[PDB]
């Protein structure tokens, strides 16, 4: 468990470090694209009901 969690932490750190400069270059577009992808995934996974309030 210790070895696996340390290695996974290193991998996640590397991924975030690589991804950060690209976002820093163009923040708005990356934010919008990631948000849309996450929302389409989550909405596809769950049942939905659209009613006005």
């Amino acid at each position: 468990y210790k070895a696996q969690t340390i290695l996974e932490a290193q991998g996640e750190v590397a991924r975030f470090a690589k991804l950060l400069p690209e976002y820093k270059a163009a923040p708005e577009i990356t934010r919008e694209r990631l948000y849309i992808e996450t929302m389409e995934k989550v909405l596809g996974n769950t049942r939905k009901v659209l009613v006005n309030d």
Binding site: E8, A14, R15, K18, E32, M39, E40, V51, N52
Partner: protein, 109 residues
């Protein structure tokens, strides 16, 4: 007969002790083997995560510049694609109104 039972019980005791010792040794060896297997798999998974992150960043660069060419139209198109993908399933229920702007032609002139 009682003496025979006692000696048989003692011999069974010795045999059970020997088998238990063997099983303990086998369990220890299997445990260390499983630890080594898990460590190797974790190392490979870390390298794979690094590769996936590199690929995602490379794709993000192209998406960022080509879509900063025109942000609003990309937002429109991507939102429409997201709507289609999310509602593709038929497990949901949608409530509308004849006053909604999409059905503005449902009402006759």
């Amino acid at each position: 007969e009682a003496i025979y039972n006692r000696m048989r019980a003692e011999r069974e005791a010795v045999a059970r002790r020997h088998r238990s010792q063997g099983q303990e040794e086998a369990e220890k060896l299997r445990a260390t083997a499983d630890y080594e297997v898990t460590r190797t798999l974790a190392e490979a998974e870390r390298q794979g995560r690094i590769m996936r992150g590199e690929g995602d960043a490379e794709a993000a660069k192209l998406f960022a510049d080509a879509f900063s060419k025109d942000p609003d139209f990309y937002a429109f198109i991507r939102s429409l694609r997201a709507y289609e993908n999310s509602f593709s399933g038929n497990q949901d229920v949608m409530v509308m109104s004849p006053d909604s702007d999409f059905f503005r032609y449902m009402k006759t002139p």
